[PDB]
Design a protein around this nucleic acid. Structure first.
Ligand SMILES: [Zn+2]
Ligand SMILES: [Zn+2]
Lengths: 91, 96, 56, 251, 77
RNA sequence: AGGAAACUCUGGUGGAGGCUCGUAGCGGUUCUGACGUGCAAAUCGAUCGUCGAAUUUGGGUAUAGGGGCGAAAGACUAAU
RNA sequence: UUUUAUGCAGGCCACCAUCGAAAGGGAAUCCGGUUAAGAUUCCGGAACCUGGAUAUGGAUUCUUCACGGUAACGUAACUGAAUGUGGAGACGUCGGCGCGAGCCCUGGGAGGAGUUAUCUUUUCUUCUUAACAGCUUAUCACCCCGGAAUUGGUUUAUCCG
RNA sequence: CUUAUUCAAUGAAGCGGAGCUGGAAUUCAUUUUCCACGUUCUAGCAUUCAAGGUCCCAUUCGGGGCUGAUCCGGGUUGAA
């Protein structure tokens, strides 16, 4: 049915550790347990093996990344600015 | 645009999806054109390029993924490749 | 176990193909294709380079 | 009185880092000929968790140009690398992720990691999770590059000093809590025997310079001169200010 | 300790010339309720293994022992 | 299943937790019980704590005396 | 060099000692019986590996270093130095699911024993088959065909195309 | 300034200089100097003093030198 109002995956942690830390942990546990999309194949077979090891079962690939998400926004900015200055330099 | 012309071909012309049926058609020469996704194995990509070089067929690279091309043709699964055998109605063969 | 591999004969240890008991057959396929394709690519790259810089 | 904890950590019998589950050092290939006259290709074959570290590593493979062999290296993975990947490393290489262009070659506003400090130390700067170094400017005549370090520090280092392009992986790690002495236990037991930390003010005065008293109180101020000694350097050392800071690092 | 079916194989085995000993076992057996038969078992012994030629025909068994050499030391049981 | 939609609920599966009851086990609260020239140079009994782990443990191995080790009692370092 | 040593024509390579676990890794054995006291160690039988000589048979070849199969791959074998590459060794913990072994429960029948004033086609008991060898057998995986929305297959657990 | 001292690598491999071969340079006379001086769609592969070309040998089973791979100095390379 509907089990939990707002603890979600942080109901295994029970009544411990404080609501705020449980909120943060909730957010990041969702991020890290979720399935993502392998860019090489588009399929939803991407998962964490370990912190910044994000591997795809279907296409048998592995990409390095954030401990809890697979693409961190900082590194996204870095990709973009790298492409920018590289285009400029070859240009 | 391109997805509109491809839907027109889905309605009027005929086609076959996927690497195996595609390259079978290309071996037979019956095909005219291929559209190829951009998420794609570069090996498969280059092999198709060679096959189409031999067949003198045309090739087009899709600014999209398997998902996007599938939505374009109107199917609901992954399509890295599509082979146009004839369009009848569309300007696909003429344009690009 | 390894010493038992040393007991048995060749038939029980590998396959009649190139890369018999080392690599998957599908991987054999893949890498053969890779070789042929990119050496052809190398060749056409070489000749286009030669002719454009010969013009130039 | 008695010898104290740091004063034993120097000798290091039980405080040596643990090593069983590490793949060895992560290092940059030697600046031999190619990386200072051209470039070389390598294949990222796999990516692997290293224990005790927080980042992952990249098992990369090059070919020794002098001998028919395949020389393997362990790199740090930046975010955006993957398996089966072609990593071009050297001077005449390309400005993408994974590559090892010199700081003399890269432009301003650039991001790098695993940066050398002097050419042939093979990875010193910004090796930990999510830490990057930014380029500032050059003085190619008397070849030097200004770089900003995650402490905000503007350092000046040579130009042949290599450095990997990208941001180090495993970011966001300390954004998560731990919630558990057990989680911290596991962390520090794969790193080194550094936990739990017990308070000197709860120790006895023989065992620390805070210990003792009918009330847990320090008594004598904890701001310690830099020119103190081994036995006195418990507390805040060479400190300029204390307390809550409100405002800016101001640099 | 290997089964054997080919009779000429068993004979050239008897003349393998490392072979020295042989045995013939009889066994009381059942094909069906009313014909409990007589299984013959020629167990020949050389060096590295024992070869067991199996037989379920007394006519063939007597022809076999008629065919065997005399010098090969036998054990009837 | 409901709802105009937003989105809400119901039954099931499933089997998480430094969760819990509780045996083995590790411990050692209370009885301030027994004994207290003992079975014992620290035990016996009942009652108790905890029991998948920051767990318990063998073996090897390192740290040696103003030194070591210490989740810290000035505790332990062969009844010291 | 066949006076001979290993000088000697040649090229290769590059630990950089050693010690360290009778519970980690590890080449190879099982049954039966046997003594006052031994046993996987003895006896009988049947096996396995290692090392080294090694001869017969067999296979290959006058197209010199095998053939069949679309393929996955198969076979009694069926050249292969230097060097290099890969794999096994070699690996957590918990859950439940399946499968197997032995045990337990049990039916019939063949023997033996017990009870029996009464009743009990009854209670108990034996009915076994090792290492090793040959033939055969499998979940997962993999190949051929063919081309899937009307979406389908499928696990206890929802994953796949 | 490097040599003394000090730091670090490395199986002490490509140092430095000059030079070809090209691009730019304005050559104000001939080059004035500067850039390069074999590699980038792809998880392949790269080894036998290198094949070739070339000069010899004793052709024979083959054997050897130059180039292929510019030359000189023998400061391993940087730092300080
Ligand atoms: Zn994928
Ligand atoms: Zn494979």
């Amino acid at each position: 049915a509907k089990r939990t109002k707002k603890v979600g995956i942080t109901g295994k942690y029970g009544v411990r550790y404080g609501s705020s830390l449980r909120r943060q942990v909730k957010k990041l546990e969702i991020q890290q347990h979720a399935r993502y999309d392998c860019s090489f194949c588009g399929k939803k077979t991407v998962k964490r093996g370990a912190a910044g090891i994000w591997t795809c079962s279907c296409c048998k690939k592995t990409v390095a990344g954030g401990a809890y998400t697979v693409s961190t926004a900082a590194a996204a900015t870095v990709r973009s600015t790298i492409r920018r200055l590289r285009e400029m330099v070859e240009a | 645009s391109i997805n509109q012309k491809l839907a027109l071909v889905i309605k009027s012309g005929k086609y076959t999806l996927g690497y195996k049926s595609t390259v079978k058609s290309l071996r037979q020469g019956k095909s005219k054109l291929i559209i190829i996704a951009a998420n794609t194995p570069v090996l498969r990509k280059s092999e198709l390029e060679y096959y189409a070089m031999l067949s003198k067929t045309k090739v087009y690279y899709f600014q999209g993924g398997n998902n996007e091309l599938g939505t374009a043709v109107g199917k609901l699964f992954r399509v890295g490749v599509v082979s146009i055998l004839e369009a009848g109605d569309s300007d696909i063969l003429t344009t690009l | 176990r390894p010493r038992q591999y040393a007991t048995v004969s060749k038939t029980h240890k590998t396959v009649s193909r190139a890369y018999g008991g080392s690599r998957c057959a599908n991987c054999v396929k893949e890498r053969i294709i890779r070789a042929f394709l990119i050496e052809e690519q190398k060749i056409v790259k070489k000749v286009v380079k030669e002719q454009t810089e010969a013009a130039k | 009185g008695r010898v104290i904890r740091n004063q034993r950590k120097g000798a290091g019998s039980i405080f040596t880092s643990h090593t069983r589950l590490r793949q060895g050092a992560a290092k940059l290939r030697t600046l031999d000929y190619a990386e200072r006259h051209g470039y070389i290709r390598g294949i990222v074959k796999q990516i692997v968790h290293d224990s005790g570290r927080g980042a992952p590593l990249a098992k990369v493979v090059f070919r020794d140009p002098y001998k028919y062999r395949l020389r393997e290296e362990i790199f740090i993975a930046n975010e955006g690398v993957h398996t089966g990947q072609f990593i071009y490393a050297g001077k005449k290489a390309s400005l993408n992720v994974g590559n090892v262009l010199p700081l003399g070659s890269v432009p301003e506003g650039t991001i790098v990691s695993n940066v050398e400090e002097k050419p042939g130390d093979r990875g010193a700067l910004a090796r930990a999770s999510g830490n990057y170094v930014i380029i500032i400017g050059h003085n190619p005549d008397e070849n030097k590059t200004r770089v900003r370090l995650p402490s905000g520090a503007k350092k000046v280092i040579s130009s042949d000093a290599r450095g990997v392009i990208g941001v180090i992986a495993g970011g966001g790690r300390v954004d998560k809590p731990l919630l558990k002495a057990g989680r911290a236990f596991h962390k520090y037991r794969l790193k080194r025997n550094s936990w739990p930390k017990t308070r000197g003010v709860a120790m006895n005065p023989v065992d620390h310079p805070h210990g003792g008293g009918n009330h847990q109180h320090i008594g004598k101020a904890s701001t310690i001169s830099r020119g103190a000694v081994s036995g006195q350097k418990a507390g805040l050392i060479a400190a300029r200010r204390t307390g809550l800071l409100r405002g800016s690092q101001k640099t | 300790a290997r089964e054997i079916t080919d009779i000429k194989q068993f004979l050239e085995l008897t003349r393998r010339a490392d072979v020295k000993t042989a045995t013939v076992k009889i066994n009381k057996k059942l094909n069906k309720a009313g014909k409990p038969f007589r299984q013959t078992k020629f167990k020949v012994r050389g060096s590295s293994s024992l070869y067991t030629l199996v037989i379920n025909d007394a006519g063939k068994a007597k022809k076999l022992i008629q065919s065997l050499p005399p010098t090969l030391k036998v054990n009837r049981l």
